[PDB]
Design a protein around this nucleic acid. Structure first.
Length: 211
RNA sequence: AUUGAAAGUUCUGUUUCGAAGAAAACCCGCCUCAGAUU
C-alpha cells in the first residue's frame, strides 16, 4: 500500500450541487477527488467507450481510496450552494495500491480544479510514502463512512449522503451511501474525533479510517 | 475532464426651484534723558 498527500491552495472555493432548489455540499465527495486525480492523464478527451456506453473518462480509477480535510474556516452560502474559503488550504490524502510511486507523484502535480470550471485550485506541495495498517483506537479528521462506530463525545457528527462509482455513467443514479463528517455547521471548520477503527492506515502522523 | 458538461439580472432616469448675520460702540485719562568734563 502506498499513500500521497497534497496541499491545495484554493482560489475562492469549490462547489458541488446535490442530486435530485440547488443546495450544495460542505466538503467535496470522493468521486470528485478521484476524477480530479484522473484528470492529469486524460487531458483532452471527454468520452471513452466503456464497451456498452460512454459514461466518463474516469471509470478507470474506480478502485482508489481518498479523503480530504480543511485547514481553515469557511462560510457556506446559498445564493447554488457554495463554500467560500478564499486563499484557504485543502489537504487531500490518496491511498492506493495500483500504480507505482512515480505515477501517483506525477499525477498529484496535475490537478487544477475541484468541482466545476470556476473552482480553480493551485497545488503547493506533495508527499509520497508507505502506509501501515492497524485496528486500534485512533484520532482522525478526515471524514469516514457511516458504518464506523464512535467512542468520543457525539458533538460534531454531520450525516450526509454520497454516490458509489456506478454514477460515473449518464442516465443513471448512483446508490446512496451514508457518510459522517466531523465538522462545525457554522462557521465551517475541521475538528478531530476519536474512533475505534477496524482498518486505519497511518500516513505520516495522521490516522485515516476507511472501515 | 469530476452530478461534471452548456448560460450576463440586461436595457431606460437631474434632488430642481428661492432667501442680505443686519443694526448700535474712542484704547484713553498722567510723565523731560536729566545732570560734570579743553
Amino acid at each position: 500500500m502506498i499513500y500521497s498527500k497534497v496541499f491545495l491552495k484554493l482560489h475562492w472555493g469549490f462547489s458541488v450541487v446535490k442530486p435530485l432548489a440547488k443546495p450544495g455540499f460542505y466538503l467535496p465527495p470522493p468521486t470528485t477527488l478521484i476524477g480530479a486525480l484522473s484528470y492529469g492523464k486524460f487531458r483532452g478527451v471527454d468520452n471513452i467507450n466503456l464497451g456498452n456506453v460512454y459514461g466518463s473518462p474516469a471509470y478507470n480509477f474506480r478502485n482508489i481510496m481518498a479523503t480530504a480535510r480543511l485547514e481553515s474556516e469557511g462560510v457556506y452560502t446559498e445564493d447554488t450552494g457554495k463554500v467560500y474559503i478564499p486563499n484557504g488550504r485543502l489537504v487531500v490524502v490518496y491511498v492506493t495500491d495500483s500504480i507505482s510511486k512515480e505515477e501517483l507523484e506525477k499525477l498529484c502535480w496535475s490537478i487544477t480544479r475541484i468541482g466545476c470550471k470556476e473552482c480553480l485550485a493551485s497545488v503547493e506541495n506533495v508527499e509520497v510514502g508507505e502506509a501501515k495498517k492497524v485496528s486500534g483506537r485512533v484520532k482522525t479528521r478526515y471524514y469516514f463512512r457511516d458504518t464506523v462506530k464512535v467512542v468520543g463525545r457525539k458533538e460534531f457528527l454531520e450525516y450526509v449522503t454520497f454516490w458509489e462509482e456506478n454514477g460515473y455513467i449518464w442516465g443513471k443514479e448512483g446508490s446512496p451511501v451514508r457518510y459522517i463528517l466531523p465538522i462545525t455547521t457554522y462557521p465551517l471548520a475541521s475538528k478531530e474525533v476519536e474512533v475505534e477503527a477496524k482498518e486505519a492506515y497511518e500516513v505520516g502522523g495522521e490516522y485515516v479510517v476507511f472501515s
